[PDB]
Design a protein around this ligand. Structure first.
Ligand SMILES: O=S1(=O)NCCCNc2nc(ncc2Br)Nc2cccc1c2
Length: 275
């Protein structure tokens, strides 16, 4: 830790602050995450074994007199910043397609190892000048991307939460507006309800038995999906609706998402970044 020189603060999260930092020995630029603890240690260290090109690599873990330092590979930008920068013109569809494909590759990998991200959001998605996109900062202040089963109090939720989050992100990339920008836990859920229809036993069996479910919920009509992500094409709209199915068991999995016609013409363009 005496090994690193803090260059600047590049981000912060609910349980950490992130610094750009150079290793004084190797010369390498890394992302340092300062945290504040024993079960988390194994868990964090099991995430070290996680090796995939679409997952931001955890290089080292450093535990100094209480204070957990996580050292991550360094990427020059995050997706929120890239979306804000592309606000007026739009990210080109080929690039959106590529990004989704890669992120689904990341998820398919993590998921086959029974590891979930849990807190996917544009700030946890990092891009390079080479057209790569990577999942960063796996969880162990934004509910905009939180799956409905979590919101409904399901404790033992599955990999499917990460697909829901990714669907929200996909829509957001396409429309340049957050899909479900909730103000609270009940506003998040009713905003989902206003768009996808109040769920019940017809579309999501078991739903009325969920911890936080209330027979008092307003009943909204599922709205026209053509109204959600115009002018996305039918292949794209088709994948997205499957990524946003209420019932986690019928929600499309990452691996199956890779085989969707939408990705028949997938390519690898680069962004124009301003670093
Ligand atoms: O403004 S940012 O998009 N904020 C993203 C912070 C997330 N942490 C992070 N950042 C970068 N590489 C790896 C990691 Br982890 N790289 C990075 C470099 C410069 C600017 C940013 C990120």
């Amino acid at each position: 830790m005496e090994n690193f020189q803090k260059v600047e603060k590049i981000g912060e999260g609910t349980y950490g602050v992130v610094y750009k930092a150079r290793n004084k020995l190797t010369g390498e630029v890394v992302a340092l995450k300062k945290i504040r603890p024993s079960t988390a240690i194994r868990e964090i260290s099991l995430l070290k074994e996680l090796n995939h090109p679409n997952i931001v690599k955890l290089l080292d873990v450093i535990h100094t007199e209480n204070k957990l330092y996580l050292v991550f590979e360094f990427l020059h930008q995050d997706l929120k910043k890239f979306m804000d920068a592309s606000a007026l013109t739009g990210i080109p569809l080929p690039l959106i397609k590529s990004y989704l494909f890669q992120l689904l590759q990341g998820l398919a990998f993590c998921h086959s190892h029974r590891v979930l991200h849990r807190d996917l959001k544009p700030q946890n998605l990092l891009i390079n000048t080479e057209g790569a996109i990577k999942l960063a900062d796996f969880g162990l202040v934004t509910l905009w991307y939180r799956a409905p089963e979590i919101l409904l109090g399901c404790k033992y939720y599955s990999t499917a939460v990460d697909i829901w989050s990714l669907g929200c992100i996909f829509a957001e990339m396409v429309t340049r507006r957050a899909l479900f920008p909730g103000d609270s836990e009940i506003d998040q859920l009713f905003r989902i309800f206003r768009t996808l229809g109040t769920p019940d036993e017809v579309v999501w069996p078991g739903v009325t038995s969920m911890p936080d479910y209330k027979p008092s919920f307003p009943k909204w009509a599922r709205q026209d999906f053509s109204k959600v992500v115009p002018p996305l094409d039918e292949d794209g709209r088709s994948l997205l609706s499957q990524m946003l199915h209420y019932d986690p068991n019928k929600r499309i999995s990452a691996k199956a998402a890779l085989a969707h016609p939408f990705f028949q013409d997938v390519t690898k363009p680069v962004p124009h970044l301003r670093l």
